[PDB]
Design a binder for this molecule. Sequence first.
Ligand SMILES: NC(=O)C1=CN([C@@H]2O[C@H](COP(=O)(O)OP(=O)(O)OC[C@H]3O[C@@H](n4cnc5c(N)ncnc54)[C@H](OP(=O)(O)O)[C@@H]3O)[C@@H](O)[C@H]2O)C=CC1
Lengths: 272, 268
Amino acid sequence: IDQYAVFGNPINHSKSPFIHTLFARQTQQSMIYTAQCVPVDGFTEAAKHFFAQGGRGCNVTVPFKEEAYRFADRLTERARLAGAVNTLKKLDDGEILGDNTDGEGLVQDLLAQQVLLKGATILLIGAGGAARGVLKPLLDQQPASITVTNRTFAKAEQLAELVAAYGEVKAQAFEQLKQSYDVIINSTSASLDGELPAIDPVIFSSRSVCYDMMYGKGYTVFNQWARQHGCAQAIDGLGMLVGQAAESFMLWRGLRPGTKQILRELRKNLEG
Amino acid sequence: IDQYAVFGNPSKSPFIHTLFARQTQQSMIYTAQCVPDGFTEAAKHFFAQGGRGCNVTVPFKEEAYRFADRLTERARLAGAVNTLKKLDDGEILGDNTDGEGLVQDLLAQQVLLKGATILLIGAGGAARGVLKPLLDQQPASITVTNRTFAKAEQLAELVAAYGEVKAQAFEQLKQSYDVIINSTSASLDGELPAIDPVIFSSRSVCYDMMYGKGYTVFNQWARQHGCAQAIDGLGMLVGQAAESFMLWRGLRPGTKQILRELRKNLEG
Ligand SMILES: NC(=O)C1=CN([C@@H]2O[C@H](COP(=O)(O)OP(=O)(O)OC[C@H]3O[C@@H](n4cnc5c(N)ncnc54)[C@H](OP(=O)(O)O)[C@@H]3O)[C@@H](O)[C@H]2O)C=CC1
């Protein structure tokens, strides 16, 4: 029985165990997955011992994604550009492969919502770690372009440079934005009372698809705002979560499981 | 879904309980939580959010003992708690399953404890936690020995009323026993307790709370004097886990399957 787990601190709000337990039951795999809380500076050592007792792979959440990045012998290209790792896997030869499934998780979620990125104009709001981790996979879907935006133009351009070798990626400050986009993806954080960054509503259109990485009961404040100006379809990041997990499950084992059932289940509990 | 966990500073419990979960088709999740502040705080919060029970690793077993609203006979005697359970009335029950795990492992290995002569090497927390359960099996006698005699004598007088129990220093041990149980740490430092191997006989059953790949240091030593059967503590670990699982779910899970899986992980 292969062992898998999720290392982080804290782990109280981790859906991974619940998620991967259901995938294993749907695809009947001889595996176990558990949540292991680890001391702020004990990930490296905690990780070493894990692969010793028969650990085949594991997810890494805050705040060990960067430390895991260094811990991995070889990193996938998507992980290299991401600068962080959320999925480790001990290969057959012995070494440990680092990877990041954020991007693909987003892409597979979009496809599930019947959103095609082929030849589309994409607007990525924000340029932090979340935004960084989704670029490459978005580009691979071959869109017309991807525009990265932040309040400060500086941080937006740097990010666009890093992935310039995979597609058409532009950068612009929020005050510059003056056109609509086919698909808007928000990676920024909003306050608990619903205050969003100062972005001109020109970005939205009647045919625009809006995807917000945040999720919760009903619609997110960002999606509600998109709908006030025309948004044709609003989606939250709950699918992305189930997606990225699904991608890790595929990586270790070799079969992508059905999220439909799981995503639905996670949402009922979320709405409860 | 019912939430369970294990609190500790550094475990196999999550793996172990998750398998019991599968086997018994129990809708529950078992996680490994960090211990900041203190256990008491983490614990209050844990049950305050819906947790139904948890395991406690060293050195929080004594603090878990105080955290419990009501203790079980075996927990009170052991002086420590490795298992906490929230009852239907909101009260938190504290119990200690280490001794029952040892006993069941021994019985599973076809070892007769009733009317047997036993030598318990050590007088720390591990020894104290297994005395009551051993005494309930009605052995002819239990000899508590420890490097520092005083502590062995104090432990023997503490449970004198529950059965035939006497203490002796290592130097005094000059006779063989039916069952020899090693509860000391000596092995961690790669050392053996200063005891004359005469204690081992060809009929002797040696049980070491320690476990690992191959035979333990203490058991290799027992084998150097023709013991009848040398056993490690892996069965104790799986056994204490199972008792806690029964305490929380009302059903008892199978230990063979799990014990064999863990054994495979140890052997490379
Ligand atoms: N395998 C593993 O990784 C794990 C194993 N365990 C088990 O749990 C138990 C926890 O120990 P616990 O009893 O609570 O610890 P304590 O410190 O409370 O007691 C240890 C006892 O062992 C005796 N002892 C220790 N070292 C020596 C030595 N070199 N020579 C002779 N006697 C010695 C001590 O005698 P004195 O009173 O004279 O000092 C003491 O009575 C251990 O026995 C261990 O087997 C626990 C966690 C991990």
